[PDB]
Amino acid sequence: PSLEDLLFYTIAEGQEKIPVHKFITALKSTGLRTSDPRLKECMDMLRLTLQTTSDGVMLDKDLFKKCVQSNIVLLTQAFRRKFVIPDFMSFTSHIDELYESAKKQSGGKVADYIPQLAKFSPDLWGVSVCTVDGQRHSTGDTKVPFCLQSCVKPLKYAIAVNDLGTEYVHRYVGKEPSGLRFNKLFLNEDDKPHNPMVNAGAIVVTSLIKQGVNNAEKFDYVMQFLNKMAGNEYVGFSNATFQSERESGDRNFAIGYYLKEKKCFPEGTDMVGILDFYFQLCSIEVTCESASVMAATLANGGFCPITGERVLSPEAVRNTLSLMHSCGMYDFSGQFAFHVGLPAKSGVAGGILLVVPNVMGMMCWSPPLDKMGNSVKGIHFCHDLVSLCNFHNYDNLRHFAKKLDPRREG
Amino acid sequence: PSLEDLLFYTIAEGQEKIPVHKFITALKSTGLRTSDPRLKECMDMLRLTLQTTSVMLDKDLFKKCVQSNIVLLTQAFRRKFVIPDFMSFTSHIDELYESAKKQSGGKVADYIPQLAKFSPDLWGVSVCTVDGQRHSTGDTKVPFCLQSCVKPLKYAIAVNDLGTEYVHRYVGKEPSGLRKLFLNEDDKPHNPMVNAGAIVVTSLIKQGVNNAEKFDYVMQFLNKMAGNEYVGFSNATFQSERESGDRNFAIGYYLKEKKCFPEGTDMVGILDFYFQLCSIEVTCESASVMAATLANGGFCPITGERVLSPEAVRNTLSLMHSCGMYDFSGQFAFHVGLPAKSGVAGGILLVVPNVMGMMCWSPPLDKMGNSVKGIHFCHDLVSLCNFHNYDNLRHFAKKLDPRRE
Amino acid sequence: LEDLLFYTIAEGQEKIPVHKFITALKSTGLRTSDPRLKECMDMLRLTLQTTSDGVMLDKDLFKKCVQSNIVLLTQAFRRKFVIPDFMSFTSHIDELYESAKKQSGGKVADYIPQLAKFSPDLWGVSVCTVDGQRHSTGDTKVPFCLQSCVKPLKYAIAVNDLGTEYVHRYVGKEPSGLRFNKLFLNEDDKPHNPMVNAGAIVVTSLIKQGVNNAEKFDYVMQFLNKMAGNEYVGFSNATFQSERESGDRNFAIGYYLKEKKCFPEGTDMVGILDFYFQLCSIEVTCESASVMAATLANGGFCPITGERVLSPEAVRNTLSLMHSCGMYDFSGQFAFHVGLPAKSGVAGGILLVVPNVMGMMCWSPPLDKMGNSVKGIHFCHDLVSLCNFHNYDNLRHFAKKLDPRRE
Amino acid sequence: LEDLLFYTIAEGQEKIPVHKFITALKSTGLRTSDPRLKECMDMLRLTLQTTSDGVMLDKDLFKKCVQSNIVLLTQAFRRKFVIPDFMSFTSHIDELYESAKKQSGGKVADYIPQLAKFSPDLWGVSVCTVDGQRHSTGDTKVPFCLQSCVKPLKYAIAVNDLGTEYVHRYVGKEPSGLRFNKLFLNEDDKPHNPMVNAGAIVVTSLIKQGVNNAEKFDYVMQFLNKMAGNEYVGFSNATFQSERESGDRNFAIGYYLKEKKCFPEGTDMVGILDFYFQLCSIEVTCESASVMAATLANGGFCPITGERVLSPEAVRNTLSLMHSCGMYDFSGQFAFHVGLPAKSGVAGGILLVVPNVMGMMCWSPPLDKMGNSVKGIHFCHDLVSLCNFHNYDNLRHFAKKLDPRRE
Ligand SMILES: O=C1Cc2cccc(c2)OCC/C=C/CCOc2cccc(c2)CC(=O)Nc2nnc(s2)CCCCc2ccc(nn2)N1
Ligand SMILES: O=C1Cc2cccc(c2)OCC/C=C/CCOc2cccc(c2)CC(=O)Nc2nnc(s2)CCCCc2ccc(nn2)N1
């Protein structure tokens, strides 16, 4: 028998001429993007064939085999409904409803501390999905660049644990939420910052990455890493934000000096330069779409879902998801872990990097923040999502009442 | 095409007439115990048949026995259970057991002479999967008191009966942070897993009846969770708990002061109730079933009864994660990443959601009040298997995944 | 000496009329009922029988009366007392009184409907100087409970009997600070200081260990009597019952103190709570308490009797801790602006000491947000505005401030 | 009367030799270099130029010299000074000095090489009474940096120039409590009090706003000069450089203060830090600082010059906060046992005030666990053991305590 022919017979649906657009529509509905890096060979071959074939454009069983041979494994999984979310079309319908519902939540205040963060409209609201299989969906303003800000903190932590290991990184930074208040103290009882998700801790993590090269190269090292995570979709940098970050960052300077005082950095740190590096990393840009891929990498045990690259060690992914759970959302972390139960990280731009382990990554973005510094619409959507689907870290996969389970069906 | 006869062929392995012994040994190896409540009909029918003579079973006789329970027996035999190769897995649990056995550190709680009576050499581990597959090693049939292990169970009951929204009017939902205080910033105890919080939870259950009936209500509930296995009560522990519980009295009075209990609570009675609930007895085996119920979305795995609402199970697992192990909670959630609850008797109620429940018991506690061997075992377990809450199900590194075959 | 005083009081003319001597004596601030004046007054009473007539003293007859108490009478008349112009001073106290009277703010403790019984309009101020000069204005003879005002008194007793070193094994010596009066124990597992509930409860357990609560109470009461020069010291059983029937916080403290092994070996903690509640229910009037305060002002000698009541060690320690921990959450503010050893109580009492000058008791039931008598606190501020009494005022160069110790 | 004093000093009219008058004068505790004695000593210098074989003042010649300063000289000689047996008293200071000398424990601050340069054997004690009577023992003329001793002085200046109300908009008035300056700010987002680094830094930003750091420093120096009656005040640039090179903690505080908008509008925060570091690097000797302390003891009048230097408002506020916040983590213990307004510095200095009696400066580089001079702390304890100087001692009834104001 033949896998290619088996798929041909599936897609054929009654002829030996599967029209090209018909194959494309079938492929798109699996949630896969036509532009999937893992589908390049197949799409190149169809483009070629559309050039050489007599106008018409209907593949022979033989011609179809010619196109899909290269990528047959992945195409089969997609078509034979084997993906983590089999009925992806229905699911995106749900994401859209959740999107529209959160859209109505107009409260919140746009971060005003930079006239840059201030530049964005409060009406921007975007949601991007990327599953662990590379199935994609977006709604709203998902192609508008914005800064990660604190969303970057778990990513740089992952990089540090990836390169240095858990044991070394946690010599410098604790592993638990502060509890004590919001961001009040810099250090816990051991004279370390409480965890990697707090400013003090992020600043220390920053000082562990790529020690002994200049900030230009350090930045490149992190950016290349971020590129892998996003499957080479948009990752940029706002110098505007960077300038404003350093011009107004008195609190961070205070933290830096105190960290110096208490000998919190690795031997021979340049403590003013680390702050500069810190400010840069917070000024890196994403769109909803590219960040959702980053989240999906974390969802996928450190493999970028749309490229198949191993990006982070599973040790780094686990540690990062652990600390995103418990420390991810500033003062709301406890409440959030309790009600939503998802590893998530917020940013002052209005971003929420969200992971549903073994299912998907997401990025929600709406500039208006709540009292505690979390995107209003983002937080509303996170609640709704977990209301709707049995995704919450301590939900049951067998008994979950009136919840929908998107991994079931097909 | 015959559901029963199909399984008969499978068990038969050719030679017509599956011997009794051989069917029993095949059944036991799926991890099921012959005393499974869901296997009652089948085992009753085998007992009947084992009276009618003084041998083997026809495809007709086998069908006679297994017809009643064919669904469950098929799943077991067609290796469909959460852990397919359960025989291999128990081998691993045994290794983990022996390894933790060698950890002789720790101090037995001597604050009550009842707790001080126990030997530091006791060490037991019981497994119950969400499918009712069981395994034990060491001293798993020795009764001991839940103590603080009871806190999540009573909380589940409260949320089950009253709902999340009401219960959390009285008790917070997050870990405290500092070791010391009774109340958080909102004048509620920080969460249900702390003494102050447990005491308040206690005052929400079965309001408006006496302590005798309240206790019965909790017992009935505990019975469902354990699939009617051993649940007892140590009056000895209870007396010592009340005679020496100055701290708890202090908490009670402060809770009274700050008007923390529901309208017109008798706070000294609630303390009495509290002391009783901490003095309830389990064995490793029975408690592992309770844990398995929590693992199983509130359905008792060995009976199939709906015991707790999924809301109560989620909330309880959430708070066990983050507040379960006193001062070690943060470290534990980080390294082990399993909902767990410890008790001063040396108990550790452990849940791996969607896989199994466990109870580990060794009386010697570490500096922070957690069973030495229990804590060592929990670490080992997660070292070995991809069970940690944020492990990846697809890419995990030279970790074993017991759900795969 | 008697003759010298005779000539002084004489004012030349006839014989000194008896009422004239009485008016002169009263104006020195002394009360005719001074215990240290007993002999003199008895003799004048006798004489005003035994020679019934015009009722004027011979130089010889005056000598007959005053010989017994000539020392004290001389000091009073030769303007040698701590406040020489006492008549003028009381005029000032009256102005300060009236000014504080106009402060109508504050809420009366309702937590016992026994405490709730008092009118918010009650307001009294009593002065007793280190020399026994007295003055009162407003409702100074109305009995009220010390409540927390008793805490320094019992502490003094404990340090008096046991010494500083032993007592401070059980109780700390500094203000709490820690987000107000929330925790029971400091970092050493002791209550922060004797002025806090937790600390007072522990102090209570150090006094007269090994006798029953009836006798313990008597022991403290006899002590309190000496301090007040045997003026009114009473007990409100009503308050006591309400104190025990609603004191959940104190019970919480008791149990925690038990837990943490904070009491002396073999304490009955529930009995100590009972004792505690009793001591808080002891009654004073403004006048009698002002004498107690004056004893503290006077290095432990009761000013109106001359009895040695407390060791100087106990008086110093108590004044030290009244300075810094005396007024609950307001202690810091109070020490800064008023700079007086003071202790407040939920009845509306403020036991006030100006070391080396006088003791005072101010009472107005309405309390401010922090639990201090509104009018009491207002008066304390005014007093220190007016006179250079603040602990760190200068005795040489002060402002437009009046200095009542100067002529 | 000059003639009156001549007879007093005469011992027996025979013409009173020069050295004999000088010896008599020195014994009152006054130094011949007293600024208030300039006229007298100038006249004696003139007269001692005329003859060449001794001098032996006439009655009219003595009158010629002393007439200018007769008031002050009389008070000194007619034993009217605050301590009127000063010879005996200095004997006691010497004993206290020798006793504290034997306390060899403690660690010299090595955080700056300048502080590390000092010998642990240095130990000096200087007394200046509110009347200008002086005494010294040990290494009292060796310059050292005030460091934190400067904090109350700058605060006084700020309150002197701006008033209490304004200054306390920026800085709190109570001790930190939480522990030893772990937090920067209290609940109101102000540093807890002027004695903490955070608070001192803010106080620094209030003085002489709107001029450059050169002039600001000059302004403070001029003020310091007045306080010390123009005795030694200097500056260690070495210390200053080390202070700024290694003061990461202070920078941390600076940035946090900036963040929380704690400075007056349009402060240059990095410059205020620079100013701060300078002020901590100002040099004194035991002797000159003891005069500064005496000014605080004397309601803001420099005892050796009679100049009004600080308003009594500033002096009271400063003494208040020295009481309660003066000695870092030991403040509470110190206030309790010693009961004197005092301020320590990491150089080993302890600026000490006994209000209405005297100022002192003790210096020994070795610090205890909490950052206070070992010998300094030991001496303060001894001093209060010996004399009834403790803030809550009684002036009439004290123990086997000596009272140097009596005679
Ligand atoms: O352990 C010690 C000695 C010690 C040692 C090292 C460090 C220390 C203390 O610093 C403490 C750090 C302060 C945190 C305040 C949170 O900040 C807040 C602000 C506003 C409101 C609140 C908290 C909530 C609240 O009321 N919590 C309380 N819940 N129960 C209380 S209060 C009183 C019952 C008695 C239980 C109890 C508790 C403590 C101690 N003694 N007894 N003392
Ligand atoms: O916000 C305020 C006013 C306020 C408001 C609400 C409650 C308050 C006080 O009570 C404090 C409640 C907690 C005490 C934890 C005791 O338990 C501990 C014992 C030992 C160590 C530690 C904690 C950790 C630690 O100290 N880290 C740091 N130590 N110094 C730092 S960091 C650098 C200054 C941080 C910047 C800063 C400075 C001042 C304030 N806040 N932030 N003050």
Provide the terminal-to-terminal Cα distance of chain B, rounded to the nearest Å. 27
* Nearest CA-CA partner of C206 in C298, C358, C314, C128: C314
Of C138, C146, C154, C141, whose CA–CA distance to C349 is shortest? Answer: C146
- Cα–chain-centroid distance for residue A54? 43
B347: helix, strand or coil: strand
User: Resolution limit in angstroms?
Assistant: 3.2
The two structure tokens encoding residue A398: 């067998």
- Mapping DSSP onto H, E and C, the string for chain C reads CHHHHHHHHHCCCCCEEHHHHHHHHHCCCCCCCCHHHHHHHHHHHHHHHHCCCCCEECHHHHHHHHHHHHHHHHHHHCCCCCCCCHHHHHHHHHHHHHHHHCCCCCEECCCCCCCCCCCCCCCEEEEEECCCCEEEEECCCCCEECHHHHHHHHHHHHHHHHCHHHHCCCCCCCCCCCCCCCCCCCCCCCCCCCCCHHHHHHHHCCCCCCCCHHHHHHHHHHHHHHHCCCCCEEECHHHHHHHHHCCHHHHHHHHHHHHCCCCCCCCCHHHHHHHHHHHHCEEECHHHHHHHHHHHHCCCECCCCCCECCCHHHHHHHHHHHHHHCCHHHHHHHHHHCCCCEEECCCCEEEEEECCCEEEEEECCEECCCCCEHHHHHHHHHHHHHECCCCCCCCCCCCCCECCCCC
Strands (E) located in A327-405: 344-346, 351-356, 360-365, 368-369
Largest separation between any pair of C-alpha atoms in chain A: 77
**Rounded to whole angstroms, what are the CA distances from C177 to A165, C193, C262, D91, D373?**
43, 11, 21, 42, 26
Interatomic CA distance for residues C339 and B234, integer angstroms? 60
User: Do C240 and C274 contact (CB within 8 A), yes or no?
Assistant: no
Q: Assign 3-state DSSP to chain A and report helix, strand, coil percentages, each to 5.
A: 50, 10, 40
Nearest CA in chain B to C269: B246
Token match 């009401």: residue?
A: B166
d(CA A92, CA A94): 5
For chains B and D, having 3+ Cβ pairs within 8 Å is answered no
Cβ contact B291:B243 at 8 Å: no
Residue with tokens 């357990």: C205
In chain D, positions 246-285, which contact chain A (CB-CB < 8 Å)? Answer: 248-249, 251-256, 258-259
Residue D236 and residue D112 in contact, taking contact as beta carbons nearer than 8 Å: no
Give Cβ neighbours of residue C162 (< 8 Å, ≥ 6 apart): C206
* CB-based contact B30:B132 (threshold 8 Å): no
Q: Is A324 helix (H, G, I), strand (E, B) or coil?
A: helix
The DSSP bridge partners found for residue B371 are B365
Tokens describing residue A282: 């917070």
What CA dihedral angle connects D11, D12, D15 and D18, to 10 degrees? Answer: -20
What does the alpha-carbon distance between residue B390 and residue A299 come to, in Å, rounded to a whole number?
Answer: 9
Determine contact, residues A273/A203, Cβ cutoff 8 Å. no
**Whether residue C334 has its Cβ less than 6 Å from ligand 1:** no
CA–centroid distance, C179 to ligand 1, in Å, is 9
Measured CA to CA, the distance from residue C342 to residue C376 in angstroms comes to 11
- D225 is known to lie in a ligand binding site: no
Q: How far apart are CA C271 and CA C279, in angstroms?
A: 12
d(Cα B333, Cα B335) in Å, to the nearest integer? 6
Residues facing C57 on adjacent strands: C16
HEC per residue, A109-169: EECCCCCCHHHCCCCCCEEEEEECCCCEEEEECCCCCEECHHHHHHHHHHHHHHHHCHHHH
B242 touches chain C (CB under 8 A): no
User: How many other β-carbons are positioned within 10 Å of the β-carbon of residue A197?
Assistant: 27
DSSP classification of residue B281: E
User: Residues 101..140 of C with a Cβ closer than 8 Å to D: which?
Assistant: 130
Within 13 A of D192's CA, how many CA atoms are on the CB side?
24
Task: Find chain A residues with C-beta within 8 A of D259's C-beta.
Answer: 250-251, 254
Beta strands, E only, B202-293 = 231-233, 280-282
CB distance A335–B299 less than 8 Å?
A: no
Total length of chain D: 407
CB-count burial class (<10 Å; 0-12, 13-18, 19+) for C50 = exposed
Distance between alpha carbon A32 and the CA centroid of its chain, in Å?
17
- Checking B91-95 for CB contacts under 8 A at 24+ apart, the result is B92/B384, B92/B385, B92/B400, B92/B402, B93/B125, B93/B127, B93/B135, B93/B137, B94/B137
Which 8-state DSSP code applies to residue B152? H
Which amino acid, one-letter code, is at A96? D
Residues in chain C: 407
Answer whether C26's CB lies under 8 Å from C32's CB: yes
How many CB atoms sit inside 10 A of residue C105's CB?
12
* B131, B301 Cβ separation under 8 angstroms: yes
- Environment class of residue C298 by beta-carbon count within 10 Å: exposed (0-12), middle (13-18) or buried (19+)? buried
* Interface contact D22, partner A, CB < 8 A: no
Burial class of residue C52 (count of CB atoms within 10 Å of its CB; 0-12, 13-18, 19+): exposed
Contact at 8 Å (CB) between C402 and C386? yes
| Ligand at shortest distance from the CA of C186 | 1
Establish, for the pair of chains A and D, how many residue pairs have beta carbons separated by less than 8 Å.
32
- Based on DSSP, count helices (H) and strands (E) in chain A, helices before strands: 17, 12
**Do the beta carbons of residue A19 and residue A10 sit within 8 Å?**
no
CA dist A58 and A68 (Å) reads 14
Contacts with A256 from chain D: Cβ below 8 Å = 252, 255
CA–CA separation, D210 vs D268, rounded Å? 10
CA–CA separation, B377 and B358 (whole Å)? 11
- Chain A neighbors (3+ CB pairs < 8 Å): B, D
Q: Check if the beta carbon of residue A118 is closer than 8 Å to that of residue A146.
A: no
Distance B327 CA to ligand 1 centre (A): 16
Touch test C–A: 3 Cβ pairs or more under 8 Å? no
The CB of D110 under 6 Å from ligand 2? The reply is no
* Two tokens, residue C323: 């300075």
Amino acid at C216: K
Angle made by CA atoms C402, C405, D1, in degrees to the nearest 5: 100
Cα three-residue angle A352-A354-A360, rounded to 5 degrees: 145
Chain B residues whose beta carbon lies within 8 Å of the beta carbon of residue C251? 253
Instruction: Give rounded-to-5 percent helix, strand, coil for chain B.
Output: 50, 10, 40
Report in angstroms the alpha-carbon separations of D203 from D158, D198, D344.
Answer: 7, 9, 18
A402 at interface of B, judged by CB pairs closer than 8 A: no
Cβ atoms of residues B60 and B380 within 8 Å: no
What H or E segment, with its residue span, contains residue B352? strand B347-352
Cα C266 to averaged position of ligand 2 atoms, centre (Å): 39
Give the residues across from D354 on adjacent strands. D358
Report yes or no: D289 and D126 within 8 Å, Cβ to Cβ: yes
Q: Which ligand is nearest to the CA of C262?
A: 1
Q: Six-digit token pair at B337?
A: 């990443």
Q: How far apart are CA D187 and CA C353, in angstroms?
A: 30
Q: How near does any CA of chain B get to the CA of A406, in Å?
A: 17
Closest-lying ligand 1 atom to the alpha carbon of residue B179: 1
Residue B312 corresponds to which amino acid?
A: A
Put simply, whether B321 touches A (Cβ < 8 Å) is yes
Q: Is C184 in the pocket of ligand 1 (CB under 6 A)?
A: yes
H or E stretch including A59? strand A58-59
Q: What is the CA radius of gyration of chain B?
A: 23
Widest pairwise Cα distance in chain B: 76
Calculate how far, in angstroms, residue C184's C-alpha sits from the geometric centre of ligand 1.
Answer: 8
- CA A144, CA A55: separation in Å to the nearest integer? 38
β-strands C282-284, D342-344: how paired? unpaired
Q: Which residue in D287, D273, D275, D284 sits closest to D235, CA to CA?
A: D284
CA distance linking residue C120 with residue C110, whole number of Å: 12
Cα D191 to Cα D199: distance, rounded to the nearest angstrom:
5
CB A381 within 8 A of CB A367: no
Report residue C343: phi and psi, to 5°.
-140, 135
Q: A287: Cβ–Cβ under 8 A, 6 or more apart, which residues?
A: A126, A128, A142, A143, A144, A145, A146, A233, A234
A399 CB neighbours in chain B (<8 A) are 296-299, 306, 310
Closest CA to B156 of B1, B298, B38, B262: B298
Place of tokens 């003293």: C57
For D348, other C-beta atoms within 10 Å of its C-beta total 31
What distance in Å separates the CA atoms of residue C70 and residue B57, rounded to the nearest whole number?
126
> Among D332, D328, D369, D333, which residue's Cα sits nearest to residue D350?
D328
Tell me how many degrees the CA angle A204-A206-A212 measures, rounded to the nearest 5.
Answer: 110
Task: Give the 3-state DSSP-derived string for chain D, with helices as H, strands as E and coil as C.
Answer: CHHHHHHHHHCCCCCEEHHHHHHHHHCCCCCCCCHHHHHHHHHHHHHHHHCCCCCEECHHHHHHHHHHHHHHHHHHHCCCCCCCCHHHHHHHHHHHHHHHHCCCCCEECCCCHHHHCCCCCCCEEEEEECCCCEEEEECCCCCEECHHHHHHHHHHHHHHHHCHHHHCCCCCCCCCCCCCCCCCCCCCCCCCCCCCHHHHHHHHCCCCCCCCHHHHHHHHHHHHHHHCCCCCEEECHHHHHHHHHCCHHHHHHHHHHHHCCCCCCCCCHHHHHHHHHHHHCEEECHHHHHHHHHHHHCCCECCCCCCECCCHHHHHHHHHHHHHHCCHHHHHHHHHHCCCCEEECCCCEEEEEECCCEEEEEECCEECCCCCEHHHHHHHHHHHHHECCCCCCCCCCCCCCECCCCC
Give the whole-angstrom CA distance, residue B396 versus residue B389.
Answer: 12
Cβ atoms < 10 Å from Cβ of A189: 10
d(CA A378, CA A140): 13
Q: Is B300 helix (H, G, I), strand (E, B) or coil?
A: coil
CA distance C360 to C129: 8
